[PDB]
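Notebook B, p. 112. Complex prediction, attempt 2.
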Amino acid sequence: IDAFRLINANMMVLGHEPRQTTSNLGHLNKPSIQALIHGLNRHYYSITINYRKNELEQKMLLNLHKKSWMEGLTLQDYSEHCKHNESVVKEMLELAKNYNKAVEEEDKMTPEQLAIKNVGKQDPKRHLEEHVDVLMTSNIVQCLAAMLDTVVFK
Amino acid sequence: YAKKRGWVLGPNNYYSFASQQQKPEDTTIPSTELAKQVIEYARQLEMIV
């Protein structure tokens, strides 16, 4: 979205947009080249647009558009979930075997240059605990929902 | 031991009752404290950086 406003021909050999003592002009857009190839800047000028952001509307749009009450303590229970815990450990075993391979290698082939000639979008720490964090968060939210539901209901 | 303890002589037979309790169990009793323990797991994963 952008708003524009036409200029006259009286200052046509002079500098149009007669702007003065302020410093909020360099923001909100620089003149883009898909827009300045046409009538910018010797035909109109660009203007600044912000939003009248208000309360009594902002939270009632936020909380009412994205909301789910009983979803926070559902289970998606176990037959879909123990299978997921079954799967991730298996390649993480081979990821640990690939983690062994670089550690027992440990050669002075200028190891910062040995690592850049062995780039593979792979193990060292990136393909590491990222999976372990997902294995951590999935089982904690699964078990905390399991223990609270035994507590609350009778 | 008739007056200190029990041991009443019946028809030439003493009597001592059962001192065994009932053992009340639920075994889902730690449901609060196990829900406590998992909280300080993630509390010690996050929040202390």
